[PDB]
UniProtKB/Swiss-Prot annotation, chain C:
The protein, known as: ATP-dependent Clp protease proteolytic subunit
UniProt note: domains: This gene contains one large insertion sequence (IS1) that divides the clpP gene into two sequence domains. The insertion sequence forms a continuous open reading frame with its upstream and downstream sequence domains.
Family: Belongs to the peptidase S14 family.
UniProt subunit comment: Component of the chloroplastic Clp protease core complex.
Catalytic residue positions: S41 (nucleophile), H66
Role of this protein: Cleaves peptides in various proteins in a process that requires ATP hydrolysis. Has a chymotrypsin-like activity. Plays a major role in the degradation of misfolded proteins.
Lineage, top ranks: Eukaryota, Viridiplantae, Chlorophyta, core chlorophytes, Chlorophyceae
Location(s) in or outside the cell: Plastid, Chloroplast stroma
Organism: Chlamydomonas reinhardtii (Chlamydomonas smithii)
Amino acid sequence: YPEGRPLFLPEAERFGNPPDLPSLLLQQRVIYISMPFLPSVTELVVAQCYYLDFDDRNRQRPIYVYLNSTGCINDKGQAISADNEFYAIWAALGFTRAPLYTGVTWKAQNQAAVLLSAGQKGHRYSFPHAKISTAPPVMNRVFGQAVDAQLQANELDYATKYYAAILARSTGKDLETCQKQYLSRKRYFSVKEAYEEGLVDKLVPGFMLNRFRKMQK
Amino acid sequence: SKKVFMIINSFGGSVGNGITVHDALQFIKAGSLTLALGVAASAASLALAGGTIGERYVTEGCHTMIHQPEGGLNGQASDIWIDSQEIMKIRLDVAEIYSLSTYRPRHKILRDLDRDFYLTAMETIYYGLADEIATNEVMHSIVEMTNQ
Amino acid sequence: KKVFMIINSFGGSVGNGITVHDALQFIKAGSLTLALGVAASAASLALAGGTIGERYVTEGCHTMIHQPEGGLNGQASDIWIDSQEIMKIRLDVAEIYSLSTYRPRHKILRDLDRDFYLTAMETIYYGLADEIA
Amino acid sequence: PNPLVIERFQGVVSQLFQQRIVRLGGAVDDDMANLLVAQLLYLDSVDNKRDITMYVNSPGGSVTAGMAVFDTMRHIRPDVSTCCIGLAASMGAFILASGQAGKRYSLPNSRIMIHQPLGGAQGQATDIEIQANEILHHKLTLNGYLAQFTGQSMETITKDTDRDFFMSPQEAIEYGLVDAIISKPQMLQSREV
Amino acid sequence: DRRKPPPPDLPSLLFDQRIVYLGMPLVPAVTELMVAELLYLEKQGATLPIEMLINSSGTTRQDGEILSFDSEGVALTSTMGFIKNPISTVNMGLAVGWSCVVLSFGRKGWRKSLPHSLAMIQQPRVPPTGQRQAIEVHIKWREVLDYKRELLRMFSLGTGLPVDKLDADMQRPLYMRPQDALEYGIIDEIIEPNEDKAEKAAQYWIRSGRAESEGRLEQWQEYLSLQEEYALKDSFRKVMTQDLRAAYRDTSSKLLKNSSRNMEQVQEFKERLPDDMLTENDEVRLPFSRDGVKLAILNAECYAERNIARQVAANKVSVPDKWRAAYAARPAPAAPAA
Amino acid sequence: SPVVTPDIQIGHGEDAIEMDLYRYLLSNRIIFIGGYINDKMATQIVGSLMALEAVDENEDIRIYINSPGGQPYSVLGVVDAMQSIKPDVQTVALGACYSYASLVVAAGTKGKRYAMKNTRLMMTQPMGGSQGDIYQIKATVEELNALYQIFSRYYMKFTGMNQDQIEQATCRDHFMTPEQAKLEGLIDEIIRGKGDYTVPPAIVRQFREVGLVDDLTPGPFLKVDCN
Amino acid sequence: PFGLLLRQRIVFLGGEVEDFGADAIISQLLLLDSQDPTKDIKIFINSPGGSVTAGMGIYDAMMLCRADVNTYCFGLAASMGAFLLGAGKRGKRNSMPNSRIMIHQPLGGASGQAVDIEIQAKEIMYHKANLNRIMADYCQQPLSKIEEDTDRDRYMSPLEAKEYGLIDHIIGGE
Amino acid sequence: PFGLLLRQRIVFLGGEVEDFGADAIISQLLLLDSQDPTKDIKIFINSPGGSVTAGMGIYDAMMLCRADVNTYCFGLAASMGAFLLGAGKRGKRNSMPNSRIMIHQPLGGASGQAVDIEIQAKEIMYHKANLNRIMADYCQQPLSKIEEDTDRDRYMSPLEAKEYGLIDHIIGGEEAVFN
Amino acid sequence: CRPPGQRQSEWVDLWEAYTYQKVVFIKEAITEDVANNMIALTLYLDSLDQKRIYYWLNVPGGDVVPTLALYDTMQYVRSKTATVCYGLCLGMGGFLLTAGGEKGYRFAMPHSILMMHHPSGASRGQASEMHIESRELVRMRDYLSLLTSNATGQPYDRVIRELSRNKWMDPKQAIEYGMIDKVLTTP
């Protein structure tokens, strides 16, 4: 009969620390993705941004998104998922009034890479030894007629048109420029030349080399 | 709590499960607000049509896939004739839901149900499966009414 | 005080039916055995192991009565030793039923030769139950 | 098993071609039906008047594989004498009923089993009702052909063909599957007085 | 509110409102919970109603997979007869096998169902024996006969139909519609949708204008035009086969035989005139079709495009290339070709 | 045959033993098509067509077809090789034909396309599967449109119908009886028995579409009103 | 191999008799009828069992032979060879003195629909009534003595098989 | 059968190209050249693919043949048969009027050590570079245009194969070719 | 045994409620993983108090090496033990009946199926190491027979001849053989 109201950081500091490691990250407004885009793991990330926009007091703290996944395309090349699952991710992440600080640990294979540039400009954090890859997506095993391959070609037509619209807003290029540079062939990007291209801006905050700390001593 | 909010994001399953979620949303006295994310398959678009008319929201990246349900099994000669009349009756049963909620004629539903028909965000509003394009404001009022 | 359990089993070894048989007589108080649906050979030992006068059965319940089954493979000598095992287990469960049905033992071995099924009517006549619930 | 049984079985089948006897054995498949079509047109070439004693012993098979076996017997010039040894199936007793009237024989301890053809349907919703029309095309033609062979009506055939129905050789004379029974005369057994 | 804790999850919330949810198929793991759920509600009062939701495929899967036996469905209906409180069951979607038997075993007058639910009854499935002996097959067939007669017994008390009627329809899997289950005896009334939701949805398409501005008027006109062209097509198919039967009766009138009076002596003696018999043979009268309707006016179609044929008269001796059969066939004055 | 298929052959002579069944039938200008039409047996039918071409250039080479389907390019190689030889080819349809074996019996010469009474024919659009990236999806739909445009004008040359009748028939799964395929122009002569003139249920449905049979007068046909 | 004895009117019922295994023997039984309908035909039985619908095709094909039928058991006759051992002509059925003879009801399986159990139980009862009539014919035994012995597995020596009626003379001496 | 075409010097290349099926065609090709070095050899190619190692041995066997060779394409020619199609003598290259021609690079898998990967990476590039410069000789095409057409995984109708330079003549008078 | 019970005021599981009541239940077979939980449970009850421990067995068989781990913990502890039989103890489970409680503390149900046989093993490879594992299986065979001879009072030469083959006992013969002490009645 009483309402189950949630508690936040100005209120739940007297109730102790959270017991489990995803619940420490949920209190710190940090979402760590260590799994590719499965239908089981996409339901929790929708409820996570729904919880962060549920009863937040200020609604202005930046949400840190750490991504480490293959997206929907595995290392062998086939599609373990489809590209329509990413449309539920960007529509739910960009709904909140809070800015989206995006970071990458190791890899972002053709679905997490377009989410890497989709964050707030001026705060794209990245590790200095990560790998970034932008390739056009593929489809799973579909057995149909001649008109069935045409409608599947229209689904990948909207995939390249939606992915280039995100890269045109991030990198500041045209619509046809991002299709020729990124979404044509399976290429890879390092950390240094991606800053000149416009994928990332800086490194992670508080980064310092252990050898550079010995030079200060 | 006079309105419920259920996010629809699934690849669909059997057509018998999509009938139950559509009949349950049209039975309760409270309002039913349905929002889709990703796609709406044959088991998911019945929950999209199961909501009340006026508050069916879809985003710009949202798609909609309508198709006839599959099935079939192995048996005797006359056993296949019984269930083939049932699949043709279920295909007419889902055509009654799409003709009532979207105000489309019955002969034009079965033409689009004959093949795997995909819809964009623009033509879903023009067909009648949804009401308007979702944005930030249509869901900002959702998360603030459920706090009290 | 009085234990009340639901009897429902369609399979299983009869060796586990002897474990639940002696556990029911270990209780000092009475026992209420109410069978529902199917009663296998492991389930009928718990049905007959209850107190006389409190074994209920429904109109649609059935009781499966059959001999023990086993799987034997190996050397020639231990098959003959295990052949006497399945024989005296079948003679043991005949003496378990004989304490309740008040029948001679040679007629129960003829019913234990093949599979024997009973409806709700002749279960009362054969003494596995008491009345119809 | 071992090919020595296959080599000694290949010899006695090769002697059956000299006595104008063909062999229908095992399940009716697509490859075995093509081996039996080519062996029927060759026996007509050496003589177009002598009959062919068809050996029928099959526990089942495909429906469209036996359809090529059926119509190739009605158009050839001599009649085909069909005999039932061991067991007849739904595609086996249809070969038994397709013989010439007055020359269909059987043994008194063989089993004649008839039912509707099996199968299945899988695919889209339009693929279900189309594939259901294929089995009903196989259901109505086998019931239409059996009404002309046995002489019975249409409604009494489908009331027995819809389920698995076994038949005795004593009742097959009264029903119309086989015409006569070939058997040796019995011994003069004395009664118990 | 402070002394009573809230329910932790969703099945505990429906348990507090006395609602039993059968959402899982009939496995032996779920049947031991339902005999513990119904026996617990009997100890809390034998007068309070029990809400029951049915959503399962029964003891077997819908594709034909055998996961359990039909005997666990017998023990589920035995607790419904042992209990002594009114039970209101609601069918939710699928109901195959023993799931509709517990739907029909509820109290008469409270059996509810959705308008688009699925109901089906069929014969129980039998697992294979694995090439055992001969005499065990007869005992296994007796196990089928005791379980089939027990299924017809529990199905007769819930509906009211006799045993011989219910056994013939159970040989084939017969699916039941919610409109068909009223006259069959499965349910008692149909759960209606919300009338407040129906009038608010109908008023929204008129005020917003989406029922006419998005091209619905041109497509609903084609639905009535295709139904008009389909009603014109079968009417032309019916008048052509009526002229074939009228020409068949005209050609049969030029016959001189006594085969019709032989069937009159062996049949009944009352109806010596053409009249009704109140049976299967409903003889239609096709020349008695003088309508004279002055409302069905013909359209703007001229029939002057019909060519002129030879118009061979009836008194001709020309016979086609056929086998000879004129043994007793005398030449008619209206048909000399016989 | 569930376990094994024995060698059903006959070779008998007063002095020497002859060959087996398929070798003797190949010497009499008769080719058999059985099983799945893959790339392996496609060289067997084309290679035997070139073997009997060098023997005689005027005798009619006969091909017996009994296959439930096959590879779409392997069944394409036997048609155009059959149309690029000197003598005429008499085709005989055996068993069933599922969208590829119905093409080779329609690819015979006019007046020599013989089908039996209980033969099943079928005509559909070719199938296929999508693979990977959009540069191969667009290559896939351009391949399925190429296979549909080639097989469209094959039936226009051998049957003489219109392209609208082919698109309405090959849209879904359409099974044709030889009595119906004789009207479409796929075959030339129907093979019957000793006065066998039974009506298949596809023509009873065709008689119901034109209005010759009703439910009151079913005639001497099979029952069809059990729908 | 076996071709040297096939010309000497000897057949071998070896291995498990399946639907194809029974087809090889009953095809040979009519070739020896076509070669000579006067000379004797000897059948050597060594089988561990088989189905009833395949082993019934060997009995009527053996009874179709107008000549004399000799049946000799070599080794094991488990539930199928014991029926064919007595099915020969009286005075010619023999067996080795150290062979095992097992008589049993014919095996069968039942699956599918519940209405198939109506049909599968009837063919078992028809095969039981058919085999018990034949086994009581050449053995000169009443029907009450046959049914109480074939209900379970029953191994027997050729000593008591002589007085039963399966064999006629012992060929191995004692 | 196949032996009747062998004495008339006509061989068949059917099915998937393997290592066991490679040397069977090479062993019978040198036997026809030793019997008659003046009579032409007609081949028939129907292959849905194959290995680049065993497929080059068929090309070296036709170059080792002193007599002229004639090719015929029926059925399929996918990434290995189209290379063996144009590799014959110019002016004696015929095919079916509806056969398909696929010009695409061969495939390959790589696994193992880090030094092991870069060896087979440049090996399949050297196989890609050698297959491009060999097929550009008998086609009379520039190298930059023929190296990008093999990257597109699209089949080729025999109508546009004639002016491309891969084939010379079409059996059927060049009117039966359907688009 | 899946629904839990109560100890005095809160919900505790059924096997752990008897752990506080100093009753040990063994229902599954003796494997390596369940023997790690049994010998850790014997040391836990020995550290709390010093009373008699009750063991109820349902072992249908098991391995040799984890069974000797549970046998040696019975003699190491300073408390007393008592083994009570219900159901069946087959293989090495019947040896644990004669582990402790020799002075009138071996009880059994009147329908318990007993089983005694020599242990077994399997280890292949080199022929030189086959001699070493054969010496280990021989030294495990006679040592398991020496403990059954001292607990039951049987001569050592009779256990080698009888338990090498298959041997089964009813509770009527288990009294005269010295394998059990008393038979449990109806109360």
